[PDB]
Design a protein around this nucleic acid. Structure first.
Ligand SMILES: Cc1cc(Nc2cc(C[NH+](C)C)cc(NC(=O)c3cccc(Nc4ccnc5ccccc45)c3)c2)nc(N)n1
Ligand SMILES: OC[C@H]1O[C@@H](n2cnc3c(NCCCc4ccccc4)ncnc32)[C@H](O)[C@@H]1O
Length: 543
DNA sequence: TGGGACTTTTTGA
DNA sequence: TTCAAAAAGTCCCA
């Protein structure tokens, strides 16, 4: 059930400027209505609009058809259309709409109990509103997913979600110059799975307004990040998009009378984006952030992908069989040649990695089971059956006791930079102990030919600065509240510079690292040093 | 007596 | 063969 304030805002967005005199026959459709939250409000708005202009309609059009008593009949016969796959919800909505008037003559209501995706829609609609489903995400039957792939290949592919198709349908059954307004998950704005959907939306309909609630819990006790999309197929020319991005993600929806108050308050920021300039990722930032990003982009000759090699950590496939506490007695049963240091995302802070508390048994270096039978029977064998169910173990590529994805040792066993894949701030650390990591920590090392131009200390100095924190967070994907995804497809696109301030920045980074490494630890001066470094970086970027 | 925050491994390519 | 993206369940505090 969509919150009432959201429904009211969507309906008002769709209908507030409709010319009832010019077209007293608007078709307003809810593809997925359920209990009918949108359609009841649409009925109330339409009744008020008709009763407001009833005498003008009577003068212009037929004088006998346009009477106050006949408004209910007209609305239910020509104006309101709803669809659903639940018969009980359809019957409830039908009963509610019938009771909206309170049997002399036959009354017809345009309600459909069918699959909106597989329905042959007879005619298009002036206004389309509502809330596509999200409860069924990956529970679609194999035949249904095949149908979606075959019939919705332009928006649905593999990991695409169901509601994507709804968008396409809503665009297709929309009358020329009509208006659509939906509330959906916001994930398609930034997820790679929705690139086709975003291109389909951009090239067909003019988007008017995007309300981005980010991680704010719009739906009570439901963990979905929602956004409201409004669009039209009118003959516009410039097609600028209003964007209302939330600022405080901890606000309460119920603490406002109307959504206009919330949007116009300090809890939201507004900015305009030229639709013709939209990229594939749909980067939505204000003027100041855009200028900041542009200055940093034009000031930096190199990028991390240009000067570094990135890789994902070890994926054992069963961590319980290969990861042990470094004080475990079973580590006396494993030759120290096969033991590597193991760290977690919690072990990585700025500029340094904590001492590894865990050891990884690099079982890929074990040749035969006869020599090392003790390890394979008393430590790793405890999960053999589960180890036997891995895909490569079943296919014969990988032996049962080996790591499923052991990567390359020489990648990990070198001076490199490691960072967690999900964090609230930039945390890039220089690894000195040849640490191995799971997939929750990504790593990269500087290319051989760029070692003379860039040093690891300088890289972690600039990358951990507040300037680069803002620079990354501008275009980073926000997967949850106060959490950013740090994946190579975004991290390796970070652009880096080098100028006359390089040596001082490197020296400050070395000072911070040395302070962080010693015994008598108090952060203190580090912060001060950081501040100076940031000044230099801003001096380098003219910001 | 409810109520959401995090990490391992599955899988398309 | 192997990479890397992204999917996927359990549990504790006021
Ligand atoms: C806050 C809180 C809490 C709790 N608990 C717990 C917690 C944890 C962590 N940390 C501490 C927080 C954990 C637990 N378990 C289990 O099993 C585990 C382990 C590991 C890992 C994992 N992951 C996963 C899985 C699957 N899927 C998914 C999906 C998404 C994401 C993720 C995920 C899980 C429990 N409780 C309450 N009450 N609260
Ligand atoms: O907010 C969601 C509301 O909307 C209805 N609804 C869902 N999905 C369709 C829908 N088509 C897609 C069908 C997908 C599917 C496939 C296999 C098994 C189950 C579902 N058509 C009309 N109403 C719908 C729900 O019943 C509910 O009232």
């Amino acid at each position: 059930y969509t919150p009432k304030i959201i429904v009211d805002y969507i309906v008002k967005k769709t209908l507030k400027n409709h010319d009832i005199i010019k077209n007293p026959y608007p078709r307003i459709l809810d593809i997925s209505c359920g209990c009918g939250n949108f359609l009841l409000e649409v009925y109330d708005i339409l009744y008020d609009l008709f009763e407001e202009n009833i005498y003008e309609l009577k003068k212009k059009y037929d004088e006998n058809y346009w009477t106050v008593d006949n408004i209910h009949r007209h609305i239910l016969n020509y104006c309101i259309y709803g669809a659903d796959i639940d018969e009980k919800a359809i019957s409830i909505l039908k009963d509610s709409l019938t009771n909206k008037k309170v049997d002399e003559s036959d009354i017809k209501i345009n309600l459909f109990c069918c699959d909106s995706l597989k329905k042959k829609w007879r005619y298009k609609f002036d206004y389309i509103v509502g809330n596509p489903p999200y409860i069924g995400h990956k529970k679609l039957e194999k035949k249904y997913k095949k149908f979606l792939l075959e019939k919705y290949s332009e928006v649905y592919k593999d990991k695409a979600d169901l509601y994507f198709c709804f968008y396409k349908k809503i665009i297709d059954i929309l009358k020329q110059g009509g208006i659509g307004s939906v509330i959906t998950p916001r994930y398609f704005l930034e997820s790679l799975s929705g690139k086709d959907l975003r291109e389909y939306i951009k090239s067909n309909v003019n988007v008017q307004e995007i309300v981005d609630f980010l991680g704010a819990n719009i739906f009570k006790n439901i963990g979905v990040s929602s956004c409201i999309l409004t669009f039209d197929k009118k003959k516009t020319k410039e097609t600028y998009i209003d964007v209302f991005k939330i600022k405080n993600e901890d606000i309460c929806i119920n603490k406002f009378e109307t959504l206009e108050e919330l949007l116009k308050s300090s809890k939201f920021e507004h900015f305009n984006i030229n639709q013709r300039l939209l990229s594939d990722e749909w980067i939505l930032v204000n003027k100041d952030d855009e200028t900041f990003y542009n200055k940093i982009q034009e000031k930096c000759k190199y990028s991390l992908e240009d000067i570094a090699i990135s890789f994902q950590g070890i994926i054992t496939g069963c961590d319980k069989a290969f990861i042990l506490s470094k004080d475990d007695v079973k580590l006396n049963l494993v030759d120290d040649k096969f033991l590597k240091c193991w760290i977690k995302s919690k072990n990585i802070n700025k500029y340094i990695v904590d001492k590894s508390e865990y050891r990884l048994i690099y079982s890929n270096d074990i040749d035969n089971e006869n020599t090392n039978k003790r390890i394979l029977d008393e430590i790793i064998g405890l999960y053999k059956t589960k180890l036997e169910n891995r895909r490569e173990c079943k296919s014969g590529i990988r032996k049962w006791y080996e790591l499923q994805w052991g990567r390359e040792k020489l990648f990990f066993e070198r001076k490199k930079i490691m960072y967690p894949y999900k964090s609230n701030e930039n945390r890039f650390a220089i690894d000195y102990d040849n640490n191995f990591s799971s997939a929750d920590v990504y790593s990269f090392f500087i290319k051989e030919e760029y070692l003379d131009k860039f040093s690891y200390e300088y890289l972690v100095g600039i990358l951990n600065s507040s300037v680069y924190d803002k620079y990354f967070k501008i275009t980073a994907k926000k997967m949850s509240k106060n959490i950013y995804d740090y994946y190579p497809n975004k991290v390796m696109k970070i652009r880096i510079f080098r100028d006359n301030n390089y040596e001082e920045i490197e020296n400050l980074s070395k000072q911070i690292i040395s302070i962080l490494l010693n015994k008598s630890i108090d952060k203190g001066k580090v912060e001060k040093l950081q501040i100076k470094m940031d000044n230099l970086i801003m001096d380098s970027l003219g910001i």
